[PDB]
Amino acid sequence: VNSFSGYLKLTDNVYIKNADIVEEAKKVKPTVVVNAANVYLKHGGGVAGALNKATNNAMQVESDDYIATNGPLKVGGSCVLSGHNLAKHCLHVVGPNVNKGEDIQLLKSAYENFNQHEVLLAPLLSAGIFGADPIHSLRVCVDTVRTNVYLAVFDKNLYDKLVSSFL
Numbered sequence: 001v002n003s004f005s006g007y008l009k010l011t012d013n014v015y016i017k018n019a020d021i022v023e024e025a026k027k028v029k030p031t032v033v034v035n036a037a038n039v040y041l042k043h044g045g046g047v048a049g050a051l052n053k054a055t056n057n058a059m060q061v062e063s064d065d066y067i068a069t070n071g072p073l074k075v076g077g078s079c080v081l082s083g084h085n086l087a088k089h090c091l092h093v094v095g096p097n098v099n100k101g102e103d104i105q106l107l108k109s110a111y112e113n114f115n116q117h118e119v120l121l122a123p124l125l126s127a128g129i130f131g132a133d134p135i136h137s138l139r140v141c142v143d144t145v146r147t148n149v150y151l152a153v154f155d156k157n158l159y160d161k162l163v164s165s166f167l
């Protein structure tokens with residue numbers, strides 16, 4: 001039993017809710033919140049900008065030190081950093097950004113990072129400003145992630161479309 005509330009069950013291990021991931025993280029304080037990161041961990045907008053804003057820019061300060069030490073992530077890769085006031089840990093995952101021309105096949109590699117964590121609160125990777133089709137992202141999630149994932153979808157219209165079209 002866990003503290004996630006109000007989710008629709010899609011499969012054995014995937015759950016979905018119309019929610020603001022920042023507010024959901026603030027209430028649940030999950031072990032892991034996933035950020036929709038880029039390779040530079042520049043958290044300017046979308047999910048990343050909102051998560052970083054909620055940490056009062058502490059996420060960005062920590063991320064800048066990470067990059068200065070380690071260099072950029074790979075598209076499809078991830079790193080574990082602090083969850084600050086939102087979660088124990090933040091798993092920064094880089095899905096391909098279609099608006100930069102990155103290969104959508106890398107979306108499966110991106111979701112594979114979730115399998116290193118037993119339970120996660122997450123957005124749909126490569127959705128929103130990353131330019132991928134969220135219905136496709138949900139399909140890849142369900143077919144790739146085997147651990148327990150709680151997906152927060154900010155847009156109510158999109159949430160209803162994802163549910164109604166789910167196979």
Ligand SMILES: CC1(C)CN(c2ncnc3[nH]c4ccccc4c23)C[C@@H](CC(=O)O)O1
Pocket residue numbers: 019020021022036045046047048123124126127128129130134152153154155
């Ligand atoms: C993850 C998606 C697919 C969907 N959107 C969200 N996802 C998770 N929580 C969210 N709360 C919100 C509040 C207001 C507007 C959007 C959201 C939102 C953001 C979009 C931008 C991005 O690319 O990050 O991507």
